[PDB]
Structures are given as structure tokens and as C-alpha cells.
Amino acid sequence: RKLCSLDNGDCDQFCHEEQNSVVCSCARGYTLADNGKACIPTGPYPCGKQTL
Amino acid sequence: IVGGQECKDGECPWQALLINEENEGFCGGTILSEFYILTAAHCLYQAKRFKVRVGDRNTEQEEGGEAVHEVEVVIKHNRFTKETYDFDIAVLRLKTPITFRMNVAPACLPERDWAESTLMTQKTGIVSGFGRTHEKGRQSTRLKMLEVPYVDRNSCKLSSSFIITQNMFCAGYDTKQEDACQGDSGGPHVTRFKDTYFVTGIVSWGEGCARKGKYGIYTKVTAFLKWIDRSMKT
Numbered sequence: 001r002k003l004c005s006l007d008n009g010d011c012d013q014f015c016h017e018e019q020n021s022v023v024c025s026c027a028r029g030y031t032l033a034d035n036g037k038a039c040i041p042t043g044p045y046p047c048g049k050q051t052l
Numbered sequence: 053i054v055g056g057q058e059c060k061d062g063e064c065p066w067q068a069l070l071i072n073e074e075n076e077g078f079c080g081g082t083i084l085s086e087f088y089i090l091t092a093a094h095c096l097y098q099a100k101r102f103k104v105r106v107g108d109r110n111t112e113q114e115e116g117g118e119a120v121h122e123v124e125v126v127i128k129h130n131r132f133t134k135e136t137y138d139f140d141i142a143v144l145r146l147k148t149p150i151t152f153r154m155n156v157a158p159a160c161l162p163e164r165d166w167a168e169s170t171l172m173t174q175k176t177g178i179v180s181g182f183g184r185t186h187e188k189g190r191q192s193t194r195l196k197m198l199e200v201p202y203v204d205r206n207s208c209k210l211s212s213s214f215i216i217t218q219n220m221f222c223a224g225y226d227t228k229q230e231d232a233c234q235g236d237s238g239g240p241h242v243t244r245f246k247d248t249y250f251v252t253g254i255v256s257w258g259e260g261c262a263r264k265g266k267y268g269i270y271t272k273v274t275a276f277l278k279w280i281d282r283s284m285k286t
């Protein structure tokens with residue numbers, strides 16, 4: 001397994017393979033972190049998080 | 053939900069409940085955004101007029117987070133038919149936006165390719181609702197959730213008395229007494245990935261509830277992602 005097939009390419013959320021390299025992205029309401037892998041909620045009550 | 057567990061505080065915040073004129077739940081839905089609810093198209097035939105309740109976990113008490121919303125626009129997939137149950141999907145635009153808070157938050161919509169290769173290949177998804185707790189009983193007054201394994205598509209087709217189209221998938225158990233049930237339809241099937249829950253299905257139909265050799269049948273949300281996006285822009 002390589003790229004997106006290897007542990008989701010180290011992405012928090014979406015993983016795409018472009019020109020043979022991993023490209024991470026995030027759901028609406030999240031911004032891709034400076035490391036280009038993590039997804040940071042832009043505001044309160046981001047989608048898909050339990051309200052704990 | 054037959055079997056499974058109660059949703060505890062904050063655990064199923066994307067659950068919505070379609071309530072009829074008598075303030076009784078008849079179907080579930082999934083909160084997609086402040087203005088939109090995802091449900092099953094067949095649910096639209098179970099009540100003449102209905103509203104959407106969010107933030108409820110116990111239909112017998114008032115925990116202060118509950119909110120009722122009127123529906124402004126019903127967007128039903130133009131290909132749905134009771135004859136095949138294919139295209140069992142609809143989107144509701146609410147008249148007023150939902151206020152997110154404890155027990156009220158949207159589920160994430162995933163990207164299609166990634167959802168098919170990474171979410172639907174996970175061992176399990178989670179189904180939730182206020183439906184019956186046994187095939188012959190009454191609706192649950194408490195919101196429940198249940199972990200349901202993804203079922204191999206070939207096995208799914210072999211087990212079914214009706215055609216499983218490409219817009220459907222199977223989840224649940226062969227013999228274990230756990231499954232969605234009456235009143236759960238239209239509700240969420242979500243898949244967890246790194247502590248984030250993505251919409252993967254809509255509770256659609258089953259030949260009874262938790263029957264041996266039968267599974268629950270879900271609308272494949274990944275097949276409708278462009279349709280949902282289009283529906284949310286108008």
C-alpha cells in the first residue's frame with residue numbers, strides 16, 4: 001500500500017493522489033492546517049463532532 | 053433500534069425526528085447544515101404535514117435543547133418509487149436555521165471516492181433513531197444508536213427477496229438480534245473516521261427487523277453526493 005492507501009496518506013480527512021503525491025483536504029467548516037494534513041474547525045459546532 | 057445502546061449526552065447530535073400533527077415521530081433524518089435535513093423519500097408519504105425536531109433524546113421530558121422547525125421546501129428525488137424503493141432520498145429545507153448546541157450539530161458530508169474507498173471499507177457504521185425496539189413493539193421514547201457492520205455486497209444480494217440496486221447497501225447482522233426498525237427510516241447511518249462522523253447512509257427498508265438471514269437496507273449516500281449538493285444550493 002502506498003500514498004492514500006497507506007494510513008489515509010496521514011490526512012485527517014479526505015485524501016487524493018495528484019501527480020503521484022498525497023493531497024489532503026477537509027469537509028466544509030474545516031480548514032487544512034499548515035502541515036497540509038490536519039483539519040481545523042473554523043468555528044463552533046463543526047460537522048461530525050460529538051458535542052461532549 | 054433493536055439492541056444497541058441509548059445515545060448518551062452529545063453522542064448523536066445530527067439526529068433529526070420528523071413529527072406529525074400529533075407531535076409523534078414517524079421517521080428520522082440527519083442534520084446536514086443549519087438549513088437542511090437528509091431523509092428518505094418514502095418518509096414523505098407517512099404524514100400529510102410534518103415538522104422536524106432536533107436536540108431531543110427523550111420524548112417524555114424536556115432537556116431544554118429541543119427545537120422544532122417548520123419545513124419550507126421538500127426536495128424529493130424524482131426517481132423514487134414505492135415499487136422498487138430505489139432512489140430513497142430527500143432533502144428538507146427548513147424555514148428557520150437550526151441553532152447548533154449540545155445535542156444539535158451536523159454530520160459531515162464526505163467526498164465520493166474517498167467515502168467509498170475509506171469509509172465504506174471500515175468494519176462498521178452507526179445507525180440511530182427513536183424507532184421500535186422489537187419488530188412488534190412501540191417506538192422508543194429514548195434515542196438509541198447501534199454499531200452495524202458493513203455487509204459484503206454479494207451476501208447482501210443473496211439474502212434479499214427484492215433487488216438491491218446500486219443506490220443501496222446492506223448493513224447489520226445475519227442472526228444477531230440488532231437492527232434498525234420501524235420509525236428509524238430516514239435516519240442517519242454514519243461512519244466514524246478519526247473521531248469525525250460522516251454521513252454514509254439513510255435508513256431505508258428491511259424485510260422485518262433483525263430477522264435471521266436478513267440485513268438492513270440503506271440508501272447509498274455516496275451515490276447522491278452531487279444531487280445533495282445541488283439540492284442545498286437551491
Ligand SMILES: CN(C)Cc1nccn1-c1ccc(N2CC[C@H](NS(=O)(=O)CCc3ccc(Cl)s3)C2=O)c(F)c1
Binds near residue numbers: 214232260270
Ligand atoms: C416490494 N416493493 C413494493 C417494496 C420494496 N421494493 C424493494 C424493497 N421493498 C421493500 C421491502 C420491505 C419493506 N419493508 C417491510 C416492512 C418494513 N418496515 S419497517 O418499518 O420495519 C423498516 C424496517 C427496517 C429494518 C432495517 C432497516 Cl435499515 S429499515 C420494510 O421496510 C419495504 F418498506 C420495502
Ligand SMILES: [Ca+2]
Binds near residue numbers: 109110111
Ligand atoms: Ca425531550
Ligand SMILES: [Mg+2]
Binds near residue numbers: 227
Ligand atoms: Mg439479520
